[PDB]
Amino acid sequence: TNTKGKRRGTRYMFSRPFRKHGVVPLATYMRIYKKGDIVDIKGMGTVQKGMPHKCYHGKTGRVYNVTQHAVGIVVNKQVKGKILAKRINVRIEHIKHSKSRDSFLKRVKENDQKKKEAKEKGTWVQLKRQPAPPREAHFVRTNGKEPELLEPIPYEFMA
Amino acid sequence: AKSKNHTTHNQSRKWHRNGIKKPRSQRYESLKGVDPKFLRNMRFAKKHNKKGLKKMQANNAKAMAARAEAIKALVVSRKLHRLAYIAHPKLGRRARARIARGLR
Amino acid sequence: MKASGTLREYKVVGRCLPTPKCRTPPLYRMRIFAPNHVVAKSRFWYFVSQLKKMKKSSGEIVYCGQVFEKSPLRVKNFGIWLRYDSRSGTHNMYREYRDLTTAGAVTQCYRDMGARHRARAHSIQIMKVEEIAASKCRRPAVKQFHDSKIKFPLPHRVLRRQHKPRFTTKRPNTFF
Amino acid sequence: FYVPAEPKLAFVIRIRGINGVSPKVRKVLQLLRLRQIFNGTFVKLNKASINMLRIVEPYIAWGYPNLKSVNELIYKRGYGKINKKRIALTDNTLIARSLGKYNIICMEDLIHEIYTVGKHFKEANNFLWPFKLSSPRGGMKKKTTHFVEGGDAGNREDQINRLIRRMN
RNA sequence: GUCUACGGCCAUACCACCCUGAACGCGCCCGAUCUCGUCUGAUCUCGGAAGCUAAGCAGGGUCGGGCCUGGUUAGUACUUGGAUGGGAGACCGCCUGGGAAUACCGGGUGCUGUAGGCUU
RNA sequence: AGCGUUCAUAGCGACGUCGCUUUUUGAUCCUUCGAUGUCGGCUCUUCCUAUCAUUGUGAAGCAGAAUUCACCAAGCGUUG
RNA sequence: AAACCUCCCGUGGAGCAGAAGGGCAAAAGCUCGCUUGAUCUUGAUUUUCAGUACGAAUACAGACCGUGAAAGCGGGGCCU
RNA sequence: AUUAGAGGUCUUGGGGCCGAAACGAUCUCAACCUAUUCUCAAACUUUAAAUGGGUAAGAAGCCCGGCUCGCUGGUGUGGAGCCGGGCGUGGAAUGCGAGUGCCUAGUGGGCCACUUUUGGUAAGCAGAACUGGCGCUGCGGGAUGAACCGAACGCCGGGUUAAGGCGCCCGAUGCCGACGCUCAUCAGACCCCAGAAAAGGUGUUGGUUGAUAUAGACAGCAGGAUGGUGGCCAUGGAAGUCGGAAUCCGCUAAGGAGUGUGUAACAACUCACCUGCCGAAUCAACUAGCCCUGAAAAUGGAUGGCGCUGGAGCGUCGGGCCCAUACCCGGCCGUCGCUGGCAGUCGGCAGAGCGAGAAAGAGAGGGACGCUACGCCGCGACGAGUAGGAGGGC
Fold first, then answer.
1. What secondary structure does DSSP assign to A3-54, as a single string?
2. Are C110 and C121 contacting, i.e. CB atoms less than 8 angstroms apart?
3. Helix (H) or strand (E) holding D81
4. Considering only CA atoms, which of D41, D30, D71 is closest in space to residue D133?
5. Among the listed residues B33, D99, C93, the one whose alpha carbon sits nearest the alpha carbon of residue A154
6. Interface-testing mutation among D57, D148, D155, with chain C (most C C-beta atoms within 10 A)
7. In C 55-84, which Cβ lie closer than 7 Å to strand H?
8. In sequence order, what are the residues at sequence separation of 6 or more whose Cβ sits closer than 8 angstroms to the Cβ of residue C167?
9. What are the chain D neighbours of C61 within 8 Å (beta carbons)?
10. Is the dihedral of CA D73, D75, D81, D85 positive or negative?
11. Which terminus of chain B is more solvent-facing, meaning fewer CB atoms within 10 Å of its CB: N or C?
């Protein structure tokens, strides 16, 4: 049976990308994290302190506590047929701001914009997203040229 | 007298009988695990919230009055819709009365 | 594609969807021999995906029409170029037939390719159908019908309707 | 060339049984309300719904329903879900009692909202109980393989009408 | 246009070689009394301003290497789902969707924030 | 490829490679532990052919004799 | 051929107690200086997990200190 | 890890070679370096999928205003917590009533298959991953069958199908079925599946490629088959006929200073080559279908059997037809749901109603049955079951 070591099987997960070793870019450190911020976890091997366990690399949670160097996150971990919202303390280097929530936050603005707008105009403007509809009926112009013929090429042994 | 060592064969089916339910979401989540220095001060902010109560209701009374004088300073074919107007039970009563004189 | 029933010839023309980069892509036309036009459209995308980097998700059919025979009352000699697959390697063949319709000659080929080489219809890529003049044919089984005075009997007339008088009295006659 | 508008409406029929079916396929099939074999339903097409049909294409046989096919289905096999009870649409008051808040007060209103996929297709289509068609009189070509390869499953675009005339 | 100080992204910025650099600036450079430190005022620290763009640095150049970004490779390899498909097998074809990577061939060669100069 | 004076294949046949058989041994552990009597010989019947002899034939580096290779073939023999 | 001195090239091809993997270049290496955060004390959390312990570990908080001009860093060993 | 040649320099070395000797030269042979080149990696990797794993898609959200703090501080700074107010097109599709707590049995030997996969020569072997099955489960089909294919089951009538089939057993082709392929003195005959390979065929059927051919093909049957010359270097002697340097033209439709068999050389002949007839594809090398060889086991023997060869075989395909407990319509039983309806049997003290798409008032100034309400009644949907649990038993 396998071992139960903490960093087991993380040969590539915690490795640095190619030609991206060395000192850590300082913009990661100067990045604010409020409470309730959606945050995705990605362990970095350069900093061995406060690394998340390998079962959270790639998961996304929300911040609930902010200390000097680390943040507390509430992540959902699936454990044999039940989900557990459990708390981890990970140091900033293994942390990114999730851009999954922002496209909703952006969409809220135009919804709040196009509501106060076109209200006094009265024009009812669609707000909900709709799936890609079946494309409309159109005309395809073949001005001049006529569609060139396609025929399967004959086989010829490559090797 | 060996035996099977380990398997997860039927497990995924067992897990989904009663569903894999996400943890119970709830607003006002607990404050266990928060930085004690931050929590200690946060409890002081609540301990003295009543100190500014008279300031609150006084600034709130004028704030409802502010908008009080504000709003008071301001304050597919016609054939089918014609029949739908007659066929309406309440607002068609005066409409389907010519019909009473129609057979007469 | 199952060569079910008699095949029909469809003219399918399609193109890539217009992108902001290329506003009007060029049109692409094919001659598909298929049972119905639904399998013709799928068999169209099979070939286009081989010659072009196009798929059904990035393209559209601008016209799915069936092309009729311009002379269904004239015996014609058809040349067919195939690309079938054997149990070991693939081959190009040139087969000749003698029919009234191109669609009838093609279905005559699928049955013949299935009988001679046990090749099933999904392994055949018919690539060119040319109706050739009688002087330019090659296969002799077709060339022997190019005779202004062709004449032959029907020697051994196999009895059909051999079950109507299931228990008859006289022996049947096989000479007429 | 005139490229017609690709269709907005599809009629889906479950052609395979309920024994030994994948968990992902089984979940989608009940999101389409197709729990019995030969159960039918209408589906408005879009990027979201079509990709659900691609998951269960070995189990269904869908296409683009004709106007006459919508008529016969609603009239002969049309049952409404009133108070979670499969009740036969015998008179218009049954429809107006439930679909009146969308100006659907007759069978024609319901057929029009179904055929020309309307602003209230969802409520109208969810009002209909899944159509319980009979087995196809005349047989099937082959239940196990796709329509294009000589079978019966998959998208048989406009040929779904011939299949409805036999199942209905 | 351009530089200095501090930066962000961290090669489109690197590397090799060649050319040109007004003004300010950065430097080289001149010294060892004091501060400080060495086997050695070379480095480090300190005090200066005679000389110089030689070098650094900046800019440009090279059918440049690299890097970045495309094309091609290629609907190929692989692959989700499907069949009472083929084959003795090894394996292969089709249906339904997704879809790469070299070689080879192009284009590109740092953007930029704050503060302060110079070209008055 | 060679051996066979000569001559690849009369008879052989290296380096390789494709199979068959279950009269060898293994591998496995399916059946039987509220028991299927576990070695040989003796006795006796039947079957198989991968044929030693005998019948009928083909081939030899078969003169004869003897002996080899192969074919149809298990009828009948195969001992003290 | 290898002692020591000097210059040049040198992205790590070395070193970091040990197995291996990861990580590291004005350092996590090497050399010095000063040191004892390898100390005292609550809870929380992670890992194995039943989501129990032990072990190990991560973030804090309260002290007492070390070091450095300082920001800081340190409650053992770069991480497993 | 690894194959091969190239171009380099003494960067060094190995025997030397003219060097006493000398990076001076000399051929070198090696390593070495620079460009290439063949072949790979579960414990290598710059790149890098498909399938997949998170999170988000609002009211617990956004937007203003004000207080609290011992936390944080150039700065009512930063953050958090509090109040108050305003915003509803409920902010992707589809589907669906959810949430939650007790008590709790049995089980804790598993097995099989598609795909992925480890050990092993392999196994109806051992071990995993994913899903579905069997176990717990009948039914139609595969002759037979725990697991394959179809399909899951209350008791029945009618209809229709699935997977399979339709010579007879045996329901259905007793179709004027379509087009071919194949002869087997071992034919062949349907997922799982129950038996064969390399190699080979002048069996037959197609294809591919390359050559000759109406300035006339290939077979067959016949005739010319020489002139310079009996060639130059050659041998006692070879004249085209033993060996090797050489290897042209006239006469011509053609004949080489020569392909086998023999003499000391000769004579002769054939051959390459050319005309006459026959009069049209001949020749070669491959390739793939069916069939055949390869192909040997023990009781007698199995495409399920009989048998089948203008198939009852193989391939491609049509119509038609047959039937499952599946699907549709109908009847009946039960369960579940509507937490459905019924006290209104409101009678000369009478007035016979609440099925009606649309928030709410038939508002005042002599007459069957029924309702053990623990009863009676109406709609829908549904029904497998071992271990186990519970309920109801007129």
1. ---TTTT-TTTSSPPTT--SSPPGGGTS----TT-EEEE---TT--TTPPPT
2. yes
3. strand D79-82
4. D41
5. C93
6. D148
7. none
8. none
9. 3
10. negative
11. N
The span from the CA of C108 to the CA of C6, in Å, is: 9
Token code pair at residue A102: 């922002």
Give the residue from C34, C37, C55, C38 showing the smallest Cα distance to C46: C55
Rounded distance between C-alpha atoms, residue D14 and residue A45, angstroms: 52
**Alpha carbon distance C167, C175 (integer Å):** 21
Q: Comparing C-alpha atoms, which of A76, A98, A101 is closest to residue A87?
A: A76
Chains in touch with A (3+ beta-carbon pairs under 8 Å) read B, C, D
DSSP bridge pairs for C13: C29, C63
Two structure tokens written together for A22? 């060395």
Pick from C47, C60, C125: which is nearest to A150 by CB?
A: C47
Tell me the two tokens of residue D96.
């107006």
Q: What is the CA radius of gyration of chain A?
A: 26
How many angstroms is the resolution?
2.8
Cα C30–Cα C31–Cα C33 angle in degrees, nearest 5? 135
Pairing of β A83-91 and β C93-99: unpaired
CA to C1' distance (Å), from A40 to H10: 63
What determination technique applies here?
cryo-EM
Nearest to A84 among B14, B15, B23 (CB): B23
Q: Does A136 touch chain D (CB under 8 A)?
A: yes
Chain A positions touching C89 (Cβ under 8 A) are: 157
Q: Which residue of B has its CA nearest to A70?
A: B35
Burial class (CB in 10 A: 0-12, 13-18, 19+), C140: exposed
Residue by residue, what is the 3-state secondary structure of C46-101? HHHHHHCCCCCCCEEEEEEEECCCCCCCCCEEEEEEECCECCCCECCEEEEEEECC
Query: Touching check for A137 and chain D: CB below 8 Å?
Result: yes
SS3 B84: helix
D146 touches strand E (CB under 7 A): yes
Q: How many residues does chain A have?
A: 159
Cα separation, C47 vs C41, whole angstroms: 10
Q: Do D148 and C39 touch (CB under 8 A)?
A: yes
From D73, D130, D43, D87, select the one nearest D97 (Cα to Cα).
Answer: D87
- Rg, chain B, Cα only: 35
Q: For B46-73, b where at least 16 C-beta lie within 10 A, e where not — what string?
A: eeeeeeeeeeeeeeeeeeeeeeeeeeee
What is the CA angle B41-B47-B48, rounded to 5? 100
Instruction: Name the nearest CA neighbour of A94 among A42, A31, A47, A148.
Output: A42
State whether D1 and C122 contact (CB < 8 Å): no
In angstroms, rounded to a whole number, what is the distance separating the alpha carbons of residues D59 and D26? 10
D57 phi and psi angles, rounded to 5 deg? -60, -25
Contact A81 B16 (CB under 8 A): yes
Query: Min CA distance, C129 vs chain D (Å)?
Result: 23
**Which of the nucleotides lies closest to A79 (Cα–C1')?**
G51
The helix or strand, by DSSP H or E, that contains position B16, with its residue range, turns out to be none
Question: Which tokens hold the place of B40?
Answer: 């200690």
